[PDB]
Tab-separated table of C-alpha atoms and ligand atoms in Angstrom:
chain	number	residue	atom	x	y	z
A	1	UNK	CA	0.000	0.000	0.000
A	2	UNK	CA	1.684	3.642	0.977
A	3	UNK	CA	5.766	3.547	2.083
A	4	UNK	CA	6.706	6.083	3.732
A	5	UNK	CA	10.011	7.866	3.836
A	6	UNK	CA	12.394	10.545	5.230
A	7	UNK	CA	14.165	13.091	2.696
A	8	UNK	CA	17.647	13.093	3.215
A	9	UNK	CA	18.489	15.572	5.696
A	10	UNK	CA	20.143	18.597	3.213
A	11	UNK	CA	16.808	18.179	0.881
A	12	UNK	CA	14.005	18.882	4.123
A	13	UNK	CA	17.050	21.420	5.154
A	14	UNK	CA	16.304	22.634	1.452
A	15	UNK	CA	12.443	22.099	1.677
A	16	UNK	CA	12.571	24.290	4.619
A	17	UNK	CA	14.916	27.318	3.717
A	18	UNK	CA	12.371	27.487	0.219
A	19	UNK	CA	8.892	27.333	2.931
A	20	UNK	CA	10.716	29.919	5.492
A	21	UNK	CA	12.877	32.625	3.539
A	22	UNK	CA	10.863	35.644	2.663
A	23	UNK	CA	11.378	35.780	-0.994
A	24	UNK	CA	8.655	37.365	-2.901
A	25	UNK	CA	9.514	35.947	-6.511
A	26	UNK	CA	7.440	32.819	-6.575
A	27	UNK	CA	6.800	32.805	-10.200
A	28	UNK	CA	10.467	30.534	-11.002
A	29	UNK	CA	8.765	27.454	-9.939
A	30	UNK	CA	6.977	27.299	-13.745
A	31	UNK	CA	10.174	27.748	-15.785
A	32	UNK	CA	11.736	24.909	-13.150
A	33	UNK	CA	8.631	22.484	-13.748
A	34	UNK	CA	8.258	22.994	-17.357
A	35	UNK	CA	12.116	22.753	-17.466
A	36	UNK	CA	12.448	19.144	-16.171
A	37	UNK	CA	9.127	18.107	-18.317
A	38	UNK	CA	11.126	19.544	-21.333
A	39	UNK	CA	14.542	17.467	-20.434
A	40	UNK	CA	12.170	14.325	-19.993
A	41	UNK	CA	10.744	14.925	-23.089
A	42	UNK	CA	14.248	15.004	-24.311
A	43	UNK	CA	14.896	12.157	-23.190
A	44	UNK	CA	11.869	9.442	-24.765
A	45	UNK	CA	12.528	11.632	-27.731
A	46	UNK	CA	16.410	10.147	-27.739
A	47	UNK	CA	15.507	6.920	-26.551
A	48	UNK	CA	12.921	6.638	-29.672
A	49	UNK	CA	15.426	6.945	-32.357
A	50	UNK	CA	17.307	3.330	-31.679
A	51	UNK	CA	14.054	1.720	-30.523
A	52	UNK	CA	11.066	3.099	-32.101
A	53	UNK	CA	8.678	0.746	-29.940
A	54	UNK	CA	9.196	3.152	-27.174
A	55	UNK	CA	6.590	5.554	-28.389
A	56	UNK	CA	3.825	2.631	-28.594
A	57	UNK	CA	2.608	3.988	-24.840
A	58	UNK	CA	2.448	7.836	-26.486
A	59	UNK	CA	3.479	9.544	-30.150
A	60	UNK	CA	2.605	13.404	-28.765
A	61	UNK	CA	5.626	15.193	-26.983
A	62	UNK	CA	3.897	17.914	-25.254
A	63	UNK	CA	3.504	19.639	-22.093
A	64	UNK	CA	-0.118	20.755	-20.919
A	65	UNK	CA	-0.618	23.464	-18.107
A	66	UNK	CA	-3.882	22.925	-16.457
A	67	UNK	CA	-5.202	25.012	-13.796
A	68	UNK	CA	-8.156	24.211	-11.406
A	69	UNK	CA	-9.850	27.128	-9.124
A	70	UNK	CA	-12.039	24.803	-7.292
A	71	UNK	CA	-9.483	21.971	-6.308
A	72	UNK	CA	-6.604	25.113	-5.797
A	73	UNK	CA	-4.258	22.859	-8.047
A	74	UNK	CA	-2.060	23.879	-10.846
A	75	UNK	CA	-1.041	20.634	-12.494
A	76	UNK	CA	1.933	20.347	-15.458
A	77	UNK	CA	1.000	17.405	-17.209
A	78	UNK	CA	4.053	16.276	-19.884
A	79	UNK	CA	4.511	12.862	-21.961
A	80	UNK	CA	8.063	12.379	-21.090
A	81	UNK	CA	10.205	9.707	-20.254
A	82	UNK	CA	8.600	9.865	-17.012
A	83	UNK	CA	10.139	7.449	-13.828
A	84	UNK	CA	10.122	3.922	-12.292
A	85	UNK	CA	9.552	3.454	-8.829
A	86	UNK	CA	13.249	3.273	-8.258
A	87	UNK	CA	13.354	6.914	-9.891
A	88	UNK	CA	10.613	8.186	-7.588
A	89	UNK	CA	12.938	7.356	-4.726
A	90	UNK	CA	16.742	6.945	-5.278
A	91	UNK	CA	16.604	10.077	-7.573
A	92	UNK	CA	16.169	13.012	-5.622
A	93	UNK	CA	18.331	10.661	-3.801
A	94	UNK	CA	21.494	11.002	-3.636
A	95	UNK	CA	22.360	13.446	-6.636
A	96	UNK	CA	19.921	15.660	-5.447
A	97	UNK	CA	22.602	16.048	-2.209
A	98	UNK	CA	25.142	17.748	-4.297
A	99	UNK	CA	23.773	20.328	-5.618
A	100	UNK	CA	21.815	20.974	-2.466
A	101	UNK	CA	24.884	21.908	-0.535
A	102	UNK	CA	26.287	23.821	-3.442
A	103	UNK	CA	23.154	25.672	-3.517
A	104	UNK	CA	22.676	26.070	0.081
A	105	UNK	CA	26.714	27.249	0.500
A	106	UNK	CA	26.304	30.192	-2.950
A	107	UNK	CA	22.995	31.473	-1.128
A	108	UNK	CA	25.200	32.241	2.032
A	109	UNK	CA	27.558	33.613	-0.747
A	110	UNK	CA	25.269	36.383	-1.817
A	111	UNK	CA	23.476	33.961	-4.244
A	112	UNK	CA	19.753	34.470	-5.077
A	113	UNK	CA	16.765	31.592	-5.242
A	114	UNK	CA	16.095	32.299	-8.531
A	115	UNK	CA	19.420	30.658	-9.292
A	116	UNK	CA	18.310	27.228	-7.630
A	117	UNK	CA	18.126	24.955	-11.557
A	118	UNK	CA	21.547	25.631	-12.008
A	119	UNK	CA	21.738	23.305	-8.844
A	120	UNK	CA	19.550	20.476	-10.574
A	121	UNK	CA	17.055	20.692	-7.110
A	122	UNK	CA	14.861	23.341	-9.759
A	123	UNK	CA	11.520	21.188	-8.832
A	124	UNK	CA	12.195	21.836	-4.889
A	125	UNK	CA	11.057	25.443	-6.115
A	126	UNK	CA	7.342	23.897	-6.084
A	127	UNK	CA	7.237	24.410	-2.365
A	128	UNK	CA	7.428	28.441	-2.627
A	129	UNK	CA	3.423	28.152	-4.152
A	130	UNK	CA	2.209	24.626	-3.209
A	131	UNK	CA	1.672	23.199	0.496
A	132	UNK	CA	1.589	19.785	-1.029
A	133	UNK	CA	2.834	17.995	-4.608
A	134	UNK	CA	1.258	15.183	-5.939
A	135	UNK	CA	3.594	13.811	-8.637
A	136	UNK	CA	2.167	11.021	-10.769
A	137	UNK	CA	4.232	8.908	-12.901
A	138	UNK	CA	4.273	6.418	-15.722
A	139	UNK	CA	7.568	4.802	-17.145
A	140	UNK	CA	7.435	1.995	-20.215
A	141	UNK	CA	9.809	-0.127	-17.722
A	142	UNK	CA	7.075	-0.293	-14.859
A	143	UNK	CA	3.801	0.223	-13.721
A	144	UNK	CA	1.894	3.807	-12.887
A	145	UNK	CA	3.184	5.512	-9.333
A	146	UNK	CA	2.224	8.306	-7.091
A	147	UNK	CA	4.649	10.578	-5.154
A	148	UNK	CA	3.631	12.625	-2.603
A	149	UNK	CA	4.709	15.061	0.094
A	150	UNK	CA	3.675	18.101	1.843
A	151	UNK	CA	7.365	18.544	3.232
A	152	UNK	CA	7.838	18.335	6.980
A	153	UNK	CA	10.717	15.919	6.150
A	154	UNK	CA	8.740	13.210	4.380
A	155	UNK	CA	7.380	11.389	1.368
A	156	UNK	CA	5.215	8.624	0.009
A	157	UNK	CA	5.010	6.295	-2.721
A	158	UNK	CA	2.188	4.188	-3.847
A	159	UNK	CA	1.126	2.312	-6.876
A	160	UNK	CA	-1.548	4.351	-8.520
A	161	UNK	CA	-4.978	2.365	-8.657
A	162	UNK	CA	-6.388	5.838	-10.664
A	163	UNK	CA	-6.355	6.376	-14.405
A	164	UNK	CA	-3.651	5.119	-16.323
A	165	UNK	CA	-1.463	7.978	-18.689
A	166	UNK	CA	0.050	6.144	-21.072
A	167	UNK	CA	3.739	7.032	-20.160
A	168	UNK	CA	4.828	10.428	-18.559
A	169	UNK	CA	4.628	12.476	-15.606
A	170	UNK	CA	2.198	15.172	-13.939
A	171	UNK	CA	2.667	17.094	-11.654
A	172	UNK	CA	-0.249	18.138	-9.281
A	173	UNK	CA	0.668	21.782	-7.444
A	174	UNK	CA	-2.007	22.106	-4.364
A	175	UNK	CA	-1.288	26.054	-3.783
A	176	UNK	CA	-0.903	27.887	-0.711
A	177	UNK	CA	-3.913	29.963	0.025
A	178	UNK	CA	-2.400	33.356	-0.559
A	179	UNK	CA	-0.929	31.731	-3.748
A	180	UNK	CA	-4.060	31.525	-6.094
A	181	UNK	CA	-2.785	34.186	-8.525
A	182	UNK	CA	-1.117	30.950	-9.862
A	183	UNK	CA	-4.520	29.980	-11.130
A	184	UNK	CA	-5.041	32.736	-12.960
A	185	UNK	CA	-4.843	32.552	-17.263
A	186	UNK	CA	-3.302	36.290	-17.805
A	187	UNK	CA	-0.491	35.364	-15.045
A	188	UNK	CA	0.384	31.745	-16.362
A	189	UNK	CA	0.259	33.030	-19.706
A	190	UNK	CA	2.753	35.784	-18.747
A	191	UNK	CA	5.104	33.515	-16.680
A	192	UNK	CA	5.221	31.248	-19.644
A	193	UNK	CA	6.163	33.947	-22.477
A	194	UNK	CA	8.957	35.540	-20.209
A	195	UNK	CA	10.409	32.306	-18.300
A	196	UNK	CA	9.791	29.360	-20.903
A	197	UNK	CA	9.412	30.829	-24.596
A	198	UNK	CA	12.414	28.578	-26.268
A	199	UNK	CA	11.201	25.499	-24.694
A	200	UNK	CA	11.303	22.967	-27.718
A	201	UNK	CA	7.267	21.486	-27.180
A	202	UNK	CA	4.048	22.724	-27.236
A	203	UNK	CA	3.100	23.994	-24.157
A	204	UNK	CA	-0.854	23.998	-23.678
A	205	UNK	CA	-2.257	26.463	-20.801
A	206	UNK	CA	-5.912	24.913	-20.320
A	207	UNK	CA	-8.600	27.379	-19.469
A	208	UNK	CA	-12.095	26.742	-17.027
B	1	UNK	CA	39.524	3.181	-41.104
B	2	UNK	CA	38.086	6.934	-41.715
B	3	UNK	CA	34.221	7.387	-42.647
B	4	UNK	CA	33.400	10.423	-44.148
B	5	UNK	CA	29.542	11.638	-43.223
B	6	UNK	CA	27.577	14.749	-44.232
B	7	UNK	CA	26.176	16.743	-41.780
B	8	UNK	CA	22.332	16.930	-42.002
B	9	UNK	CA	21.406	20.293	-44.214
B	10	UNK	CA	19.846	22.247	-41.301
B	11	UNK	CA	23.085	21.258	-38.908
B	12	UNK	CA	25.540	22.535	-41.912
B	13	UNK	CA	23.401	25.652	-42.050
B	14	UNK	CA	24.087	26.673	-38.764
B	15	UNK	CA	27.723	25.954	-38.984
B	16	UNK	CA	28.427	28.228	-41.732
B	17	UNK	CA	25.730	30.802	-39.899
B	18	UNK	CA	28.106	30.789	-36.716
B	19	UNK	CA	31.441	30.708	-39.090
B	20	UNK	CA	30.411	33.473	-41.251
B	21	UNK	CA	28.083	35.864	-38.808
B	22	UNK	CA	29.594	39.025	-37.473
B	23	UNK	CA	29.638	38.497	-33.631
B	24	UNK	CA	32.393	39.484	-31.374
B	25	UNK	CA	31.306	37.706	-27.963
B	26	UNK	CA	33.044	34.431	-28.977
B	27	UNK	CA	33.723	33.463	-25.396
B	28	UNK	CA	30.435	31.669	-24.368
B	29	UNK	CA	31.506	28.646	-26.459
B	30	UNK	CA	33.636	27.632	-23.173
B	31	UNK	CA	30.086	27.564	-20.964
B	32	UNK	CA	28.953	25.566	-23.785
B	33	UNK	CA	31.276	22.823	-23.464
B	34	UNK	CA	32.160	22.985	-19.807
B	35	UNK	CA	28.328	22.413	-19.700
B	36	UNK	CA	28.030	19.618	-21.655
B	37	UNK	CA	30.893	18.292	-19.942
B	38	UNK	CA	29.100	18.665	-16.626
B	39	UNK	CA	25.505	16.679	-18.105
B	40	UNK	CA	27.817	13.677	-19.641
B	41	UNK	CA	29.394	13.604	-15.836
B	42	UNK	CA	25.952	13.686	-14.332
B	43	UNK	CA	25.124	10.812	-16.674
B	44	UNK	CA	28.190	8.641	-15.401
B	45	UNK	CA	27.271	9.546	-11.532
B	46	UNK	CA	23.419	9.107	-11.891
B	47	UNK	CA	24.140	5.311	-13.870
B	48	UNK	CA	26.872	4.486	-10.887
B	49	UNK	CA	23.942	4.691	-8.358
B	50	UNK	CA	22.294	1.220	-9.118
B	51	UNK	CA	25.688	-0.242	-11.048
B	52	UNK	CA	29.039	0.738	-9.343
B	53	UNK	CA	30.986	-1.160	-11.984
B	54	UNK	CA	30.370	1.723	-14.199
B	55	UNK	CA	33.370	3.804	-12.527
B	56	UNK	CA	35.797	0.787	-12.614
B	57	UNK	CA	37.216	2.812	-16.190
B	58	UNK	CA	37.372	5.780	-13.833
B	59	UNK	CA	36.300	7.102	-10.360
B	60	UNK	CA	37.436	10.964	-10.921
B	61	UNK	CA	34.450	12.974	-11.855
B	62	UNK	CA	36.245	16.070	-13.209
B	63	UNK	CA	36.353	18.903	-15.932
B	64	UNK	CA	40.188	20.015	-17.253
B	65	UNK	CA	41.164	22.861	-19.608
B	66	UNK	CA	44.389	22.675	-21.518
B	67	UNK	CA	45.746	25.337	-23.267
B	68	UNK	CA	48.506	24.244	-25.694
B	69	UNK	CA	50.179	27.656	-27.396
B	70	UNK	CA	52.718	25.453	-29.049
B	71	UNK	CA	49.991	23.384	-31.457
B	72	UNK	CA	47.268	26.505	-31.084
B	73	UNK	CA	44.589	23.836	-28.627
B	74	UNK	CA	42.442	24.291	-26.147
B	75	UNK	CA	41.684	20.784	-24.956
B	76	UNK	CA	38.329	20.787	-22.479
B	77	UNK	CA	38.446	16.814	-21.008
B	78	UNK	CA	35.687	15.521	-18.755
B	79	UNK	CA	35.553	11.925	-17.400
B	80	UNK	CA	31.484	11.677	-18.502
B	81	UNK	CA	29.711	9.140	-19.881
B	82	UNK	CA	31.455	9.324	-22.875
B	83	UNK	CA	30.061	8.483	-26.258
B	84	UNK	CA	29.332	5.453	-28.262
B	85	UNK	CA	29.785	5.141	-32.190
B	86	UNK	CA	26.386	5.644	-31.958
B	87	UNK	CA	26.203	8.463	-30.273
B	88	UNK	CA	28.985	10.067	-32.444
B	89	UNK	CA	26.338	9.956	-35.709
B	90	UNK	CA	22.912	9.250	-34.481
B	91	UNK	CA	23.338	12.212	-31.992
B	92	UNK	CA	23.775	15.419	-33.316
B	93	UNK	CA	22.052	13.664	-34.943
B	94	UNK	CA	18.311	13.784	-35.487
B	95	UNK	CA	17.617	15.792	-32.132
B	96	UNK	CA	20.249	18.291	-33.260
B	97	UNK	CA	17.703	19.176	-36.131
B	98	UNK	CA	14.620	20.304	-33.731
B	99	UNK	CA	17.146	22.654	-31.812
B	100	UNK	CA	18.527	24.108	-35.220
B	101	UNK	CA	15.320	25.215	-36.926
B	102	UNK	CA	13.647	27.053	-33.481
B	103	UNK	CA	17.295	28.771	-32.718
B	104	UNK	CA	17.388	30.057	-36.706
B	105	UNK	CA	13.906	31.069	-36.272
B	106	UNK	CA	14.639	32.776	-33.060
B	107	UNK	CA	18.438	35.053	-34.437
B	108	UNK	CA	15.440	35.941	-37.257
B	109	UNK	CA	12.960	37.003	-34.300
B	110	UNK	CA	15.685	39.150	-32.866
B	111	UNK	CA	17.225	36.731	-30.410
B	112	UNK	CA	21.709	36.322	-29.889
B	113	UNK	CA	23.970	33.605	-30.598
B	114	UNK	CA	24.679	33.717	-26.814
B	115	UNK	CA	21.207	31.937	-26.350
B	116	UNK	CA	22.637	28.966	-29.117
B	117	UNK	CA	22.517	26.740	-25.509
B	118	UNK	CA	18.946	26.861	-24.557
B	119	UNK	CA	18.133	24.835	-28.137
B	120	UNK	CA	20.561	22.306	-26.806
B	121	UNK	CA	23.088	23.099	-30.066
B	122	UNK	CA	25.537	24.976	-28.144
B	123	UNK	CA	28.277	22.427	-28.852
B	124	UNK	CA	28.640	24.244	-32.471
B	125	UNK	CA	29.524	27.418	-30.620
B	126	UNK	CA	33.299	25.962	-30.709
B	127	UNK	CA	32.900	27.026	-34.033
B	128	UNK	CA	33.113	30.820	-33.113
B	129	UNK	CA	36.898	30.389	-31.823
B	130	UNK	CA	37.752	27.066	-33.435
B	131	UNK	CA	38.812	26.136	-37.609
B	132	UNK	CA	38.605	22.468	-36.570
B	133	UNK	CA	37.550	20.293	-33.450
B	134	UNK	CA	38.846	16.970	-32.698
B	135	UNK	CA	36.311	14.726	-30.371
B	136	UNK	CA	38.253	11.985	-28.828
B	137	UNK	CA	35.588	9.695	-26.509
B	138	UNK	CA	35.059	6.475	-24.512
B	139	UNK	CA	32.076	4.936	-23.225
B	140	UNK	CA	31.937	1.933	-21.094
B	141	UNK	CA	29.650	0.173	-23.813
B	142	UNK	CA	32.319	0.656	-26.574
B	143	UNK	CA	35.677	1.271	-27.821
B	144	UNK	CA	37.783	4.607	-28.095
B	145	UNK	CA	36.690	6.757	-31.233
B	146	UNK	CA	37.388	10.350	-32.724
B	147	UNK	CA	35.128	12.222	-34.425
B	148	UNK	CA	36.556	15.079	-36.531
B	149	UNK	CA	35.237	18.069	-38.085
B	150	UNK	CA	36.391	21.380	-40.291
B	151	UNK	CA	32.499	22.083	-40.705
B	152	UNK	CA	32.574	22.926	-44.435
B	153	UNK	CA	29.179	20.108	-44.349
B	154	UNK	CA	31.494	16.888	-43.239
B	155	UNK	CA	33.104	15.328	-40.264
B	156	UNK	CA	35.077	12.064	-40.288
B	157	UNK	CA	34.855	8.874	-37.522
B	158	UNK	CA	37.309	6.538	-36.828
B	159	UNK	CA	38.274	4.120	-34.361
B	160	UNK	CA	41.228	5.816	-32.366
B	161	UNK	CA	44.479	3.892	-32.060
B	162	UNK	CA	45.587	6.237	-29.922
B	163	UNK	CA	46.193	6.589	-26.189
B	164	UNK	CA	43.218	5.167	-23.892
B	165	UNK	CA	41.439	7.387	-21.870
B	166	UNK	CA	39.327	5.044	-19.669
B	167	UNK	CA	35.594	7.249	-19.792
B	168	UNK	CA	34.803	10.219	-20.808
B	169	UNK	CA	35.166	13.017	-24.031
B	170	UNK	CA	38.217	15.199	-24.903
B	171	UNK	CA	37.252	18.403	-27.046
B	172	UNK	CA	39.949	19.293	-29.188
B	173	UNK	CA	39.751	23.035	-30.516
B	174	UNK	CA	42.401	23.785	-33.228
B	175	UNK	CA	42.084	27.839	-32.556
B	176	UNK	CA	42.147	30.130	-35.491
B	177	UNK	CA	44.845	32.253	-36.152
B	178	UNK	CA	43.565	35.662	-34.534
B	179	UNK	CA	41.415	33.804	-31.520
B	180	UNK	CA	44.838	32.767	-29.136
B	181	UNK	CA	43.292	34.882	-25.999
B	182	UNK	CA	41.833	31.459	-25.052
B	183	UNK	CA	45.099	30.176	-24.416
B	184	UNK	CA	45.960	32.830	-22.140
B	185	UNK	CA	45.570	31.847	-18.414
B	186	UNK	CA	44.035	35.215	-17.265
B	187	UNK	CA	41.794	34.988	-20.100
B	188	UNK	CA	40.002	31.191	-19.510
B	189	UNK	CA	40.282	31.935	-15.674
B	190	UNK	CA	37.716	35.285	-16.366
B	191	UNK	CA	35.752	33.149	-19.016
B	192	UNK	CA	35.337	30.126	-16.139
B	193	UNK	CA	34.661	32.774	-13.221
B	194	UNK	CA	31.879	34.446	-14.871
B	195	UNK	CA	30.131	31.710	-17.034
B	196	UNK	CA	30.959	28.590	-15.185
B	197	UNK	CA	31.066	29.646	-11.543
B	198	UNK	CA	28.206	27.173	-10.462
B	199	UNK	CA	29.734	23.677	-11.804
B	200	UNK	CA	29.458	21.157	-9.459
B	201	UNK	CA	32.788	19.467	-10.738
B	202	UNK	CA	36.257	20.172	-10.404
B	203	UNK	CA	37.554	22.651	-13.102
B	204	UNK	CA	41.345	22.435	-13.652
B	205	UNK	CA	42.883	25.062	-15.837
B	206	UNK	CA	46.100	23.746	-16.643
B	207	UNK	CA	49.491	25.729	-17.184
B	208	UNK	CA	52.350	25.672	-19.704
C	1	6GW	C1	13.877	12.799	-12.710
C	1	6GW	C2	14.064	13.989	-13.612
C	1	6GW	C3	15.008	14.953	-13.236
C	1	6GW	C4	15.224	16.066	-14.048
C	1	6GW	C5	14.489	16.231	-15.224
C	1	6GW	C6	13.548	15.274	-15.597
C	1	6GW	C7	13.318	14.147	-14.796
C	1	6GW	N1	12.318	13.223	-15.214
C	1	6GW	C8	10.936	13.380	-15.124
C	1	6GW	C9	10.266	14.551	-14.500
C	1	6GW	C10	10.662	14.942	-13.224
C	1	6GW	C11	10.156	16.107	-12.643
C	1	6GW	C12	10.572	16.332	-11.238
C	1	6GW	O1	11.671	16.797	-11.009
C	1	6GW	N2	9.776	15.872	-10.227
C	1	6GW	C13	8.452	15.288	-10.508
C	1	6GW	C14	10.213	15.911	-8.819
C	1	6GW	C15	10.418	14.530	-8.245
C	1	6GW	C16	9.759	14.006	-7.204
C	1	6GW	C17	10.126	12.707	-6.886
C	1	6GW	C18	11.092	12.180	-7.656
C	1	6GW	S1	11.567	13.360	-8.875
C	1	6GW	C19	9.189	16.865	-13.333
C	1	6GW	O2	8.703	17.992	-12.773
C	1	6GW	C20	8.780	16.483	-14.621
C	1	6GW	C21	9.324	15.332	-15.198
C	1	6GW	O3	8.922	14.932	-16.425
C	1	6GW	N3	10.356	12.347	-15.682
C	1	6GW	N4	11.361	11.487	-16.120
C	1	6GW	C22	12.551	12.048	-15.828
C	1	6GW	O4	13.648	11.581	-16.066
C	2	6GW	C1	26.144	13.855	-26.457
C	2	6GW	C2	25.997	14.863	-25.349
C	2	6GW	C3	25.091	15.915	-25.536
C	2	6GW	C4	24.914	16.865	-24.531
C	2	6GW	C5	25.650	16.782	-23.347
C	2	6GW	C6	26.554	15.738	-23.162
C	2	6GW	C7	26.745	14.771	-24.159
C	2	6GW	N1	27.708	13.749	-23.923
C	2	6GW	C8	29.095	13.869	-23.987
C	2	6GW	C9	29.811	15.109	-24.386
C	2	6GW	C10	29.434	15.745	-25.565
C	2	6GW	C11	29.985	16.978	-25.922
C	2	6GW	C12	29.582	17.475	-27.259
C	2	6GW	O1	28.502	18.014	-27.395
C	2	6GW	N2	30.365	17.181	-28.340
C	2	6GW	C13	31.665	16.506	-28.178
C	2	6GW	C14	29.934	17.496	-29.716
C	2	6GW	C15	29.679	16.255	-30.535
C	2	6GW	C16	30.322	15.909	-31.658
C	2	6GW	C17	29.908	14.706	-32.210
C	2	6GW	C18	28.921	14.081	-31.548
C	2	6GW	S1	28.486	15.032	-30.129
C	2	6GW	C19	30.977	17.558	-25.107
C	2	6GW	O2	31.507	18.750	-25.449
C	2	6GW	C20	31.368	16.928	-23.913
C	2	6GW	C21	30.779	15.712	-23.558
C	2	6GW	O3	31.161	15.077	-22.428
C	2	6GW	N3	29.634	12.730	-23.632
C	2	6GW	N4	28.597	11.841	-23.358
C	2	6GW	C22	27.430	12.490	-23.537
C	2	6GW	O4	26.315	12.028	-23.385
């Protein structure tokens, strides 16, 4: 059923330094999320060229933006590569701990959050809009997963008994209350034109 | 012995565009290697997670810049993943072609040749300082090749007799006649310090 497990100690040292520091530029978490859907994408779009069978579970490389008032979720849906179970845990993981610390030692160095993806911990940015993150997960090497974790030093993994998605990953962003602007078409819509405009895929922002 | 290839149209297009184009900032082509240097080493590190017998052909994960006034070279070696044969033609390469047309599309839209990196093409950058590059690799799946290349719409791979190099990729940049300043000391040091500050490798800048 659900495992549960502890972060290692520098990423809910991360986790909390992104929920505690005043930092009012929130926005970066889209051009992070779309970032890693677009290097995943990448990725199933490399793997396809030796072994064209690898596109059987999904032809469309794309990345959809879909917001939803009433559930207070912003989710980033992309057909990717996506991740095994093995992925969900021991990635993000132990190379996650590198770049943490080099992260954590250039912010005491004058360094700005902004500057976090240069660290490869980019989706750790989530946590300056959402209270929780639901990731969801399909790889053509094993069966459908769900991530979860509202911080506080922890994280599950389950399989996912919900609707299958062919092969990729979503990602489902509950917001912090005084974060709903994220919702909003005009502001995604800007984010995405002046953070993500030479991502190689179509990016789809959904409307209600 | 040597194979002689064409490059596909659209990658030969953009190699005479960066040859020929009036543009004095040649120095980002370092951050473009240096950073491709750093993804092939967080290849080797991420694989060495569930099989450890990937770093018996080398533990050192590590980044080192060789100037060479004597032959005009500037050698960048990293101990990454290295490259197959495969990975020598197939790769850059089909997914070179997606990157191509939206970054020619983009210099027409206004955009620089500093932004040749976010179309994941930066490699061709070397281009800007360099009248030929030499590619020596070594991936644990394969044998020792060099790839060669004077752009002019050909390159040439052959197996390398030469002397092993256990895992990883050696850039070879035969400098043009008026671009020595990269083999200058003070020079690659400023280049590194403002471009490549936040590499989580070891850069060596060696000394003649
Ligand atoms: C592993 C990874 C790292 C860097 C770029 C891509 C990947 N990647 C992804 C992928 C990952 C993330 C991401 O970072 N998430 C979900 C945080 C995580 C929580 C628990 C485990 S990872 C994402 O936002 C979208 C994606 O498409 N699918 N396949 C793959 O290789
Ligand atoms: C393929 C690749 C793409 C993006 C990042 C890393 C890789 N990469 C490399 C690697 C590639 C390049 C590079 O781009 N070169 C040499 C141009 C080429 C000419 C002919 C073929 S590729 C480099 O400067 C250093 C590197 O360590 N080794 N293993 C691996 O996966």
């Amino acid at each position: 059923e659900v495992e549960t497990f502890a972060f290692q100690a520098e990423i809910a040292q991360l986790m909390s330094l992104i929920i505690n520091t005043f930092y009012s530029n929130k926005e970066i978490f889209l051009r992070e999320l779309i970032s890693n859907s677009s290097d995943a994408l990448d990725k199933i779009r490399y793997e396809s060229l030796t072994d064209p069978s690898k596109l059987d579970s999904g032809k469309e490389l794309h990345i959809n933006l879909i917001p939803n008032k009433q559930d207070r979720t912003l989710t980033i849906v992309d057909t990717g590569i996506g991740m095994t179970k093995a992925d969900l845990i021991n990635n993000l993981g132990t190379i996650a701990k590198s770049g943490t610390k080099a992260f954590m030692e250039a912010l005491q160095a004058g360094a700005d959050i902004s500057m976090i993806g240069q660290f490869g911990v980019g989706f750790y940015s989530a946590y300056l809009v959402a209270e929780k993150v639901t990731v969801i997960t399909k790889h053509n090497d094993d069966e459908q997963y769900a991530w979860e974790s509202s911080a506080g030093g922890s994280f599950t993994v389950r399989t996912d008994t919900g609707e299958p998605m062919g092969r990729g990953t979503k990602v489902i962003l509950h917001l912090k209350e005084d974060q709903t602007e994220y919702l909003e078409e005009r502001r995604i819509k800007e984010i995405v034109k002046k953070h993500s405009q030479f991502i190689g895929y179509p990016i789809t922002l959904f409307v209600e």
